[PDB]
Design a protein around this ligand. Structure first.
Ligand SMILES: [Zn+2]
Lengths: 67, 136, 213, 101, 25
RNA sequence: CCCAUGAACGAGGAAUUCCCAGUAAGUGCGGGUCAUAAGCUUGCGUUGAUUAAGUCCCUGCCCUUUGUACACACCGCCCGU
RNA sequence: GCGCAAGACGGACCAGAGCGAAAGCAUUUGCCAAGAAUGUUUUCAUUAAUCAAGAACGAAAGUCGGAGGUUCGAAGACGAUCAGAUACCGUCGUAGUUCCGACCAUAAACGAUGCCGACCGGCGAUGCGGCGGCGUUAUUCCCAUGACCCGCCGGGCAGCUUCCGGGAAACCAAAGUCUUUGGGUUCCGGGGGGAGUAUGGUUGCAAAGCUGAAACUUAAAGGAAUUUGGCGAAGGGCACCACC
């Protein structure tokens, strides 16, 4: 990497299905606060409501399946 | 050893030839002529396992080694000539090619044109195997 | 034991004058070690470059070849050797439910440069066409191929290399073929697929020096 | 008994077709009988396209695709789960399944 | 036992007995 | 019951058991066994949480489709020297 | 990376599209010869699809004589796998795979369904030829040509549906018009093994094709299809005595 990325914070807008082999992760749709034009799909471990916000070290990589 | 250009604004261009079979991978880097190579490392040179010669881990190791060698030489931009085994057999590239190209890009080296240089035939000779072929 | 990049030179290559950007890249070769001469091992090097890295803003998937034949010091001056196409574009235009037409012509310029003009052609379905097949008869394909051969032997025989190389840079021969063949069967994807060098004359330094200005 | 109205092929008035070779196996399956695959995909897949975008000397460069045609023997087409088995009434569907994804 | 190798064995037996008859005279 | 005697044991390898709210767990008290008698079992009561509102990856079970030369039902049938 | 030489093959365009009596047929161009279908207010006028004797063609493999042997590859050699491999798997490799001529005439040569002719539902498409008609295009005006669109006709490879009808059922616009049996005409089968075997003839350089029984033995061998069964087949659902 060798790239310094400032921390960007993002807000959930819709909950989706749960990925993972044991049903431990959750695919979810989350949108940013600084620029609400683009929305990203991320994998989150833990119980997630609709309405709260998230903390992201990166804002680039896409979510995927269990592996 | 070094190059006569300025190292502030502009960058130099070479080509990296990436062979990707199903049991080996190559990261071969030559000049823009394609004749004068500078450094060639293969995925079988970094792991002590004959079955693990074609993998993203060996591809990342070979890509980091050739990126370090090119940084000591001073080659700062590359064009990818990606190819599979080609020929009469299969044409799908190996699984380590994407990770090798990703690890070459992650070292801080510029990436230009990307094209597929698989030597596809019009119609080649008879392939390996019988009429029933290879079965198990 | 010793590293083999200490007795290595560095050279810069140049493109001929029909293009916009003269500087295209760099190469390197070893020093003159005894009977071997570094200029002798610098001749047989084909430079395979793209058109969009050679012009300012034009078609990117067209490609050209450059062969080195001029060196005097810290400079290599090339010439046209072949025009190719990217495989992704060629595989993108090829699709089902259409007729592919291919014509190859052997033709010579005014000077001793023997070319081989490969070309392709792909049919187009109309905007109100309800059918799916959209093929053509074999004699229609023969008439289209004859028209393509006489067009690409018309435009190379009359002129020299310096005009047809400048003509190959934009879509001119393809647009002429597409405009002429609208009456036989309307086809849209016509491009010169490959140009191959066949014969080259005795080497002359004056024409090569006047190539670059 | 006769399972299908045709014989798993597209030969009606020919009697002979040119044989092809499988990609995984080397079976000399006839061309009209084999399962033919035409897939399109990028040169590097979506796990690295952002890193490729932030490593280029160009601006908003479009990643090229890769084109390849695959010929599958039917044993290889079922073992690799390209095509599955169906019921008696569900076999009379020449249309492909819908491609939602 | 399918018919191909049964036919092959009958062919080999017939060839052996025909060779024995033709070389016995 | 009283006084002496004061070992192993420093939170435990591979492997494995049980459990979503007054729950697990730390504690005590009743009943059975009982002539003397509970480290067992069944009940009662006190204090009282961490995590989860999902999945078919592992361990099993159920169902649909397909194939069958099996119907003593694969521990089945059956080819040859 | 640059060129050189040899042999093989014509991918993507390639389709339930075309041609041919059947095997079979896919780079461009030229030469020779043939043919289905469409069109005809031309011509001969019964000259006919049916066929034992006889005759041509006939996938691959197999034999014989010439230069070639790229790839692949029977037999053979080697190394793993396995209780056991002169099997599956991998590395080499002779004869063949490639050409010209001389042979054999056997395939799941299969639409596992002879050929001609008449009749019997609908619909949507595709290939050829002909015909009719608003509109767009080869840039703007007018005609013919090609392209697209809307139909009709004739032949052909094919597709969807059914209480026409048939069949034992799978299924069939033919496998229908059949006890309410009869349009014409070649080959061919009488339970299952023995057995496509022995002998005789015939054909062939060889390998081997064609015709082809009997003695004896058995009460079964077979075709279609429904329910549990069982998969080293696929797809789902549930469970803190399964998991996170
Ligand atoms: Zn296969």
């Amino acid at each position: 990497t060798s790239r310094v990325q400032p921390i960007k914070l993002a807000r959930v807008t819709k909950v989706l299905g749960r990925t993972g082999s044991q049903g431990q992760c959750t695919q979810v749709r989350v949108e940013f606060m600084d620029d609400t034009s683009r929305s990203i799909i991320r994998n989150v471990k833990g119980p997630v409501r609709e309405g709260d916000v998230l903390t992201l070290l990166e804002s680039e990589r896409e979510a995927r399946r269990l592996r | 050893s070094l190059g006569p250009q300025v190292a502030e604004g502009e960058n130099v261009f070479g080509v990296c030839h990436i062979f990707a079979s199903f049991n080996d991978t190559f990261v071969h880097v030559t000049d823009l002529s394609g004749k004068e190579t500078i450094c060639r490392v293969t995925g079988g040179m970094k792991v002590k396992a004959d079955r693990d010669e074609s993998s993203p881990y060996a591809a990342m190791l070979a890509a980091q080694d050739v990126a370090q060698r090119c940084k000591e030489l001073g080659i700062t931009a590359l064009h990818i000539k990606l190819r599979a085994t080609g020929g009469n057999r299969t044409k799908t590239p190996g699984p380590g090619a994407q990770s090798a190209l990703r690890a070459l890009a992650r070292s801080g080296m510029k990436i230009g044109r990307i094209e597929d240089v698989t030597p596809i035939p019009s119609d080649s000779t008879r392939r390996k195997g019988g009429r029933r072929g290879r079965r198990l | 034991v010793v590293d083999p990049f200490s007795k290595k030179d560095w050279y810069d290559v140049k493109a001929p004058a029909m293009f916009n950007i003269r500087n295209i890249g760099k190469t390197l070769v070893t020093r003159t070690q005894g009977t071997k001469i570094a200029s002798d091992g610098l001749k047989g090097r084909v430079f395979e470059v793209s058109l969009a890295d050679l012009q300012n803003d034009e078609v990117a998937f067209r490609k050209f070849k450059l062969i080195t034949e001029d060196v005097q010091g810290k400079n290599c001056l090339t010439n046209f050797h072949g025009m190719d196409l990217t495989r992704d574009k060629m595989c993108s235009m090829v699709k089902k439910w259409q007729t592919m037409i291919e014509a190859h012509v052997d033709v010579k310029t005014t000077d001793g440069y023997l070319l081989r003009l490969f070309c392709v052609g792909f049919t187009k379905k109309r905007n109100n066409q309800i059918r799916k097949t959209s093929y053509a008869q074999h004699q229609q394909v023969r008439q289209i191929r004859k028209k393509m051969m006489e067009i690409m032997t018309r435009e190379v025989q009359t002129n020299d290399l310096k005009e047809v190389v400048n003509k190959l840079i934009p879509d001119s021969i393809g647009k002429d073929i597409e405009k002429a063949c609208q009456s036989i069967y309307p086809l849209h994807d016509v491009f010169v697929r490959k140009v191959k060098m066949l014969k080259k004359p005795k080497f002359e330094l004056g024409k090569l020096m006047e190539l670059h200005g | 008994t006769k399972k299908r109205r045709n014989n798993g092929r597209a030969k009606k008035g020919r009697g002979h077709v040119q044989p092809i070779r499988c990609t995984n196996c080397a079976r000399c399956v006839p061309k009209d009988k084999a399962i033919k695959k035409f897939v399109i995909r990028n040169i590097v897949e979506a796990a690295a396209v952002r890193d490729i975008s932030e490593a280029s000397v160009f601006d908003a460069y479009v990643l090229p695709k890769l084109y390849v045609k695959l010929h599958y023997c039917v044993s290889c087409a079922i073992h690799s789960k390209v095509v599955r088995n169906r019921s008696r009434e569900a076999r009379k569907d020449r249309t492909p399944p819908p491609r939602f994804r | 036992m399918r018919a191909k190798w049964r036919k092959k064995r009958m062919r080999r037996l017939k060839r052996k007995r025909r060779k024995m008859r033709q070389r016995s005279k």
